[PDB]
Write a protein that binds this ligand. Sequence first.
Ligand code: COA
Ligand code: 54W
Length: 210
Amino acid sequence: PYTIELIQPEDGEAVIAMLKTFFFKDNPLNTFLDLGECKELEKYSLKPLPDNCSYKAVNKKGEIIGVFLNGLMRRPSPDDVPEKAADSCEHPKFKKILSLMDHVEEQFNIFDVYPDEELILDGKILSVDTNYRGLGIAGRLTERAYEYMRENGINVYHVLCSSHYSARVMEKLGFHEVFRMQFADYKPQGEVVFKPAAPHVGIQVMAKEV
Ligand SMILES: CC(C)(COP(=O)(O)OP(=O)(O)OC[C@H]1O[C@@H](n2cnc3c(N)ncnc32)[C@H](O)[C@@H]1OP(=O)(O)O)[C@@H](O)C(=O)NCCC(=O)NCCS
Ligand SMILES: CC(=O)NCCc1ccccc1
């Protein structure tokens, strides 16, 4: 028995404690790189909270057993020159992840798919405690975001998935692929950066219109 609740920035420490236990260790990219201590990922994870559209799953004892951290994303201004997130990162391993994200954004702009949309919901970090996996918590976290979307006239939910494993969960929830890139094809300086196990395949950007 669990609740799905809005995350408050005062929940930050508890959210980070949970992420350090699971996501930091078991996201396919993190575990491949052996991420270790990563204050930059902590910073990254806390950033979307004040947008007031991130959700926690909480068990009967009051412990966080899942999160979906979401932020609002706005269409680039006409005069915008994009910034690389990787430029402001000192952590070498996390910088590789940010560089991959920058590369995806350089190759694919979600706002090109949806020319009429000014604001899109961006699902940034999804993580469920191992002992509570396979119970539909990911879906219930996602469903709470649909409520926020309805309340605010947002039509598109965008989620970058770092493995085919997680893309499949989003597919079950009614998302569809809008962009993909195999890890084997990601060669920013001529050589492969990421080679997790074969079933992960690569990144998939998933979208749903609600
Ligand atoms: C991805 C993740 C959030 C899924 O959350 P979830 O609440 O377990 O989602 P679901 O209940 O829909 O289960 C998804 C699938 O996991 C599998 N599964 C079933 N039991 C499981 C268990 N005990 N442990 C792990 N996976 C299980 C099933 O294939 C299941 O699909 P199905 O129920 O439709 O048959 C979770 O695995 C996770 O935290 N992964 C590591 C962090 C990560 O990569 N986050 C990015 C996600 S985009
Ligand atoms: C929806 C979701 O959880 N995407 C994860 C992307 C990601 C972010 C930071 C480090 C590794 C991987």
